[PDB]
């Protein structure tokens, strides 16, 4: 059957370039229109460019028109995408797809893309903050601006983990990952129970213990 396996992506400080690589193995590549599609985390799919079977004409989306370049190399059934001046928004997953034979407007077989990550950062830590509480209120901790992905949380070293859920982080523009955790308790137990978050960020070799309190403010 058809086969398309992207390759050549990862982490890259903004600006300098990087080239992706797709390889067909399931037909007569030499005669198939090629497609580049990307998908940021969450955001839908965004069409990028297209190249003919012989690599003559090609159409790019203003969304890049000029920042990128889509060359191919039929001798070694390999599809390429040159990315110069890597803007941050370009972080996403790059899908390589083959358009139909007599219907270039039809991407019949795609392959699990390959992840791109435009971020100029190198190991850093957490920046914990207190989400002052206010049927029965909820409160939490706001971890923010860390680079190395892995980061775990807990509250009071494991005392009844119920009523808690720690969201997934998010690659802000500064290419910095942030995430929060939240808890729910008897709004009747304010000023009687001590709530603190046992944060942890290995890549930074750090543990943090912010003790959240009720906002007697405003």
């Amino acid at each position: 059957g058809v086969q398309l396996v992207e390759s050549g992506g990862g982490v890259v400080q903004p600006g300098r370039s990087l080239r992706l690589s797709c390889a067909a193995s399931g037909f007569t590549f030499s005669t198939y229109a090629m497609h580049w599609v990307r998908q940021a985390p969450g955001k839908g799919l965004e069409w990028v460019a297209i190249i003919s079977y012989d690599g003559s004409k090609k159409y790019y989306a203003d969304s890049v028109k000029g920042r990128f370049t889509i060359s191919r190399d039929n001798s070694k059934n390999t599809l390429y995408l040159q990315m110069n001046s890597l803007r941050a928004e370009d972080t996403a997953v790059y899908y390589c797809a083959r358009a139909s034979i007599a219907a270039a407007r039809v991407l019949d077989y795609w392959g699990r893309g390959t992840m791109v990550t435009v971020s100029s950062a190198s190991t850093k830590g957490p920046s914990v903050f207190p989400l002052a509480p206010s049927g029965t209120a909820a409160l939490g901790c706001l971890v923010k601006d860390y680079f190395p992905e892995p980061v775990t949380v807990s509250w009071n070293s494991g005392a009844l983990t119920s009523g808690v859920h720690t969201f997934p982080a998010v690659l802000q523009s500064s290419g910095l990952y942030s995430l929060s955790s939240v808890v729910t308790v008897p709004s009747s137990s304010l000023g009687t129970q001590t709530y603190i978050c046992n944060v942890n960020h290995k890549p930074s070799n750090t543990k943090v213990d912010k003790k959240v309190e009720p906002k007697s403010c405003d």
């Binding site: 599609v37 985390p41 969450g42 839908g44 799919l45 965004e46 069409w47 297209i50 159409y59 790019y60 989306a61 203003d62 969304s63 899908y95 139909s100 219907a103 407007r105 039809v106 991407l107 019949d108 077989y109 795609w110 392959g111 699990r112 893309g113 920046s127 903050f129 207190p130 989400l131 002052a132 909820a138 939490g140 706001l142 923010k144 119920s162 859920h165 969201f167 997934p168 998010v170 802000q172 942030s178 995430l179 929060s180 939240v182 906002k215 403010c217 405003d218």
Partner: protein, 211 residues
């Protein structure tokens, strides 16, 4: 352009239909296709050239075109079905392909439920850290699909926003978070900030101010 709703949902064997609308510059003249992208795998050509299926696609997956909008119908839903879709077409004016806003077809396994917003205002600390981070907590909704966007006072804006994707939680429901990072002074000036969690037609706009 090209809007499909963020949602649809139905029972473990019923019908459903997702829409697609753009303009005469696209869909109205150019052939439309539809793609099914499950969570982490790649997409799969479902319907092409308006109503066409690749031998490999059931007959229940159908699709029409009325004016400048196309629609993908589906009957006898199966857990299998539950995945995200996209209606795409070629736009004659921008000379470049176009994709859809996407739709998540969730096949009802549990009773619907409304999202539980809980907008947290900047922490006293961080503010000092010359920064303003607004947290909009969203939770406990069955059809894991919502829409998030903020509003500084009257007017809205996206300049400085970042929303996660839903994600199932212990209690079987989904739950995601938004973020509105600011400048402590931007926090000062604008006399009001609100988080909007539209979901299933019914929205929820929670607001909080400086004081």
């Amino acid at each position: 352009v090209l809007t499909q709703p963020p949602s649809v949902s139905a029972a473990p064997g019923q019908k459903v239909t997702i829409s697609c609308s753009g303009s005469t510059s696209n869909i109205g003249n150019n052939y439309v296709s539809w793609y099914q992208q499950h969570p982490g795998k790649a997409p799969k050509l479902m319907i092409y050239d308006v109503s066409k299926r690749p031998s490999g696609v059931p007959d229940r997956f159908s699709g029409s075109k009325s004016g400048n909008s196309a629609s993908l119908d589906i009957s006898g839903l199966q857990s299998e079905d539950e995945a995200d879709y996209y209606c795409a077409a070629w736009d004659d004016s921008l000379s470049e392909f176009l994709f859809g806003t996407g739709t998540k077809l969730t096949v009802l396994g549990q009773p619907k439920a409304a999202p539980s917003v809980t907008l947290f205002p900047p922490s006293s600390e961080e503010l000092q850290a010359n920064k303003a981070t607004l947290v909009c907590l969203i939770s406990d909704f069955y059809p894991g699909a919502v829409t998030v966007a903020w509003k500084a006072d009257s007017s809205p804006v996206k300049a400085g926003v970042e929303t996660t994707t839903p994600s199932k939680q212990s209690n079987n429901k989904y739950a995601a978070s938004s973020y509105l990072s600011l400048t402590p002074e931007q926090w000062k000036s604008h006399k009001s900030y609100s988080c909007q969690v539209t979901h299933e037609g019914s929205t929820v706009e929670k607001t909080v101010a400086p004081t």
